[PDB]
Specification:
256 residues; alpha/beta; Rossmann fold; 6-stranded mixed sheet; 5-stranded parallel sheet; 11 helices
């Protein structure tokens, strides 16, 4: 059970799921309700904390290719660079399986996930309707965004796994980069039948209290699904299972 220091938060959940002995993890995982709980008791570290990592005697240090302290981490233990692909969330997990030699266990997990979300999507569509469109909005640093299926934040579960229909303009605007900034006073142009908003637990945000927002058909019909921004930032198996249950449950209860 090698001692693994996970500097890149994105891979904490995936390596944890596969049984890795994680002795250090980037503090950012605490912004997630799911990962905060999974990693309680595990030493937290911040970018630049090379000595803290060293104190944990890691055998492998997991980092992003763009990490600037690689030249420093290497003096402590071999430093593993894992590809950062926002779109390929399932092969991200297969990459991690290669590190710990558990790629068949990943394939099995993958099969279960795809089949399960396929049926989940079907149940959801019987509820809200096959042609019901679902939008995704996320306020980040005073700026409003909308994502497609290849940018996480729940987009992979909504559009790739469940196979739910994206709002038309939302799909065009995000096709290119997978994301796109939105003008709050143009929100209506992207507002679908249902709206998934990452404002859960937050005092009603600014974009959710404008007269246009209040007049959206989804808002008036009670079709606004709020989710925890911090939790939805990740795409590891644990997080994926959570968003899966969380989105399925909220859409269905709000249905029609």
């Amino acid at each position: 059970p090698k001692r693994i220091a996970v500097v890149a938060p994105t891979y904490a959940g995936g390596l944890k799921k596969l049984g890795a002995n994680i002795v250090a993890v980037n503090q950012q995982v605490d912004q997630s309700k799911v990962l905060k709980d999974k990693f309680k008791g595990v030493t937290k570290i911040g970018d630049g904390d090379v000595e803290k990592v060293a104190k944990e005697k890691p055998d492998l240090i997991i980092v992003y290719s763009t990490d600037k302290d690689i030249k420093k981490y290497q003096k402590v233990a071999p430093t593993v660079v894992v590809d950062y692909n926002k779109h390929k969330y399932l092969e991200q997990q297969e990459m991690l399986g290669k590190i710990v030699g558990k790629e068949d266990k990943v394939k099995a997990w993958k099969k279960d996930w795809e089949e399960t979300t396929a049926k989940d999507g079907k149940e959801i569509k019987k509820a809200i309707g096959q042609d019901a469109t679902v939008s995704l909005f996320d306020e980040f640093d005073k700026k409003l965004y909308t994502y497609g299926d290849n940018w996480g934040r729940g987009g992979e579960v909504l559009y790739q796994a469940f196979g739910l229909k994206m709002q038309p303009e939302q799909q065009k605007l995000t096709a290119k980069a997978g994301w796109a900034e939105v003008k709050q006073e143009e929100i209506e142009k992207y507002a679908g039948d249902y709206i998934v908003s990452t404002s859960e637990g937050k005092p009603t945000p600014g974009y959710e209290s404008t007269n246009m927002w209040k007049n959206l058909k989804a808002t008036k019909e009670g079709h606004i699904v709020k989710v925890d921004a911090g939790t939805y930032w990740y795409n590891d198996p644990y997080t994926l299972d959570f968003m899966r249950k969380d989105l399925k449950e909220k859409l269905i209860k709000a249905a029609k």
